[PDB]
Structure formats: C-alpha cells, structure tokens
Amino acid sequence: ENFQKVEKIGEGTYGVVYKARNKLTGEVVALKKIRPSTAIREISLLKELNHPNIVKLLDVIHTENKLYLVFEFLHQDLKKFMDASALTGIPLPLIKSYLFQLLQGLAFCHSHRVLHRDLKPQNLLINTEGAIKLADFGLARAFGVVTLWYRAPEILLGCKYYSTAVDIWSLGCIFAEMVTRRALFPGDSEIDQLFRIFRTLGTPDEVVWPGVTSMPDYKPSFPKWARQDFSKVVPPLDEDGRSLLSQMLHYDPNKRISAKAALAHPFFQDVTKPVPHLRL
Numbered sequence: 001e002n003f004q005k006v007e008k009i010g011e012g013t014y015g016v017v018y019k020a021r022n023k024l025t026g027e028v029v030a031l032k033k034i035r036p037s038t039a040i041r042e043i044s045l046l047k048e049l050n051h052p053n054i055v056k057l058l059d060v061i062h063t064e065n066k067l068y069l070v071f072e073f074l075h076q077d078l079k080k081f082m083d084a085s086a087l088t089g090i091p092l093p094l095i096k097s098y099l100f101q102l103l104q105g106l107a108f109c110h111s112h113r114v115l116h117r118d119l120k121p122q123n124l125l126i127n128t129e130g131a132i133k134l135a136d137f138g139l140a141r142a143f144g145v146v147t148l149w150y151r152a153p154e155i156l157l158g159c160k161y162y163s164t165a166v167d168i169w170s171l172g173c174i175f176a177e178m179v180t181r182r183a184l185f186p187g188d189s190e191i192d193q194l195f196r197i198f199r200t201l202g203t204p205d206e207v208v209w210p211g212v213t214s215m216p217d218y219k220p221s222f223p224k225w226a227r228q229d230f231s232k233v234v235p236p237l238d239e240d241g242r243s244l245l246s247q248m249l250h251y252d253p254n255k256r257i258s259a260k261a262a263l264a265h266p267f268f269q270d271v272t273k274p275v276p277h278l279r280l
C-alpha cells in the first residue's frame, strides 16, 4: 500500500528484504517481509531499543497474516565492503573503529538483556560517515543455507540457554575475517563447523571448559586436536589485537570477555573514526 519497492536487497532467515520508499513521507527504508502474539509483543519491545550502532526499527506492521518490519536503510553491508577491499585489506584503523562501534552496540543490547544470536557480515551495515550498525537484534528470540560460520561452540554442542557470550564469539570471528580477508571457520555442516573450531583452538576438555563433557551433543569420541598459536591464526595482527581476539574466542562462555570489558581493552588505546571510501 504505502511502500514502493525499489529493489530486492536480499533474502534473510525470516523473508525477503526490499529497499522501499514510503509514498507518504518520501523516507527510504528497508522493508522485511516475515514469512503469533508472542512474536508481536517481543518485536514491539525492540522498537524502544535505540542506539547509534543499532539499525533503527521504524515500525512493525501486521496485516492479513502478514508481518512487515520497517528499518532504517544503510547503503552497504560489511560483506560487500570486505569483498571490495579484498586485494588491499581494510586498513587496521578502520577495522579497529568498526570493532569498537560494534562492541558499543553489543554492550547496549546486552545491558537490556537482548541478544542477536546470528551475527554475520551481511547483517553489519555501514554508511559514508564511518559508522557501522548491527541489523536484526532480537529477531532470533522473537521468531524462534543458513551460515554456521559464526556460531559459538556452546550452540553447536546443544546448549539450550544462550548467553550474551554467543554474540562476542560471532564478532570475534568477524574481527578475524576483517584482518585476514578469509573466513576463520567456514564449516559446511554442524560437525564440520565444530571440528574446524577444534582444529584451530584445540578440542575442548574439562580443564579449559568445565562442564563441556556433559553437554547434550558432546561425544567422547571427538578427535583430540592440539591448539595452534594465534600467531598462525590471524598473522599480520599485533599482540594487542591477538590478545583481544583470544579473549573473544574463549571456549567457556563464562570466561569469554564481555562487550563492556572489551571496550576497555588496550587494543582500543589509539582508536579513531576513519571514513571508508564507499562506491555506491
């Protein structure tokens, strides 16, 4: 009715996403068609979760067994930017700026007990002013091939209770990918994802992760790989970077660094806000 579709942006976990224009206000927006009253109330709460590093939810529209979410539109995602920067690499000051901003976003949502649970380059969105913002916070909780590459090990091992730590894991995986220009753990099945994590960080045990062996999908028959050094994992990256990444990829979700504590890490001593060159 009120929205003119301009182009399909892509296909999310819950449905198609279009760039659209509000025929009444002229506002340009992202419109997500979601393909239960519980979900309505949860989504409505998210309208109040407003932060400069969170993509704003402008409105929720249910009509005729159809649910539409109207979001703030940004002009590029991190995946396309990484791909465009592939020959050169994103400069470290911009990597650092983006990480810091995403941690501020996480810190905010986490303080309101809201998780993302499915962070990935395609839902991190950038603009021409050097900002990066998280899209689709809270949607996994609200609504209940999908990429496994950013999935925390506790999820893969069948934990039913997700903590804020699952988002730190995902963002650590993204940090590593910005630095190396390749995905850290590109699994193509749940077991391939778990074994790629184990091949790099070592098969977890009760020493490094108390309780791991009692987890639902833990098998004593898992191969026992030794941990490799982070020097080999994200090589170019300096020791402050490697320190912070190591704390973001701790196996035990209780030991994994919080967003708030990561903002105080020494890696961010010299943080700045560069503007990227974006070709739109």
Ligand SMILES: O=S(=O)(F)c1ccc(Nc2nc(OCC3CCCCC3)c3[nH]cnc3n2)cc1
Pocket: 009, 010, 011, 012, 013, 017, 030, 055, 071, 072, 073, 074, 075, 076, 077, 080, 081, 122, 123, 125, 135
């Ligand atoms: O780089 S591209 O030219 F490909 C490009 C990408 C995104 C956008 N803009 C964009 N996209 C969104 O969601 C995409 C969706 C998220 C994950 C699931 C599947 C894809 C948004 N959600 C709220 N605001 C949004 N703005 C503009 C260009």
